[PDB]
Design a protein around this ligand. Structure first.
Ligand code: ZN
Length: 55
């Protein structure tokens, strides 16, 4: 099988309100997530190397 959520990790009952970043590993509630969204977007936009696209 190739399923997920099948490995040992910490236990909590609030992982649905929190948000996590697949490239940063930090967890934010909601108002502090705005600072992550701007900075993580700026880095991901700036990280543009070996690019090639034409018609
Ligand atoms: Zn991030």
């Amino acid at each position: 099988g190739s399923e997920f959520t099948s490995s040992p990790r910490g236990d909590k009952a609030a992982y649905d309100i929190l948000r996590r970043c697949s490239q940063c590993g930090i967890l934010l509630p909601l108002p502090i997530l705005n600072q992550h969204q701007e900075k993580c977007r700026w880095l991901a936009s700036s990280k543009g190397k070996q690019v090639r696209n034409f018609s």
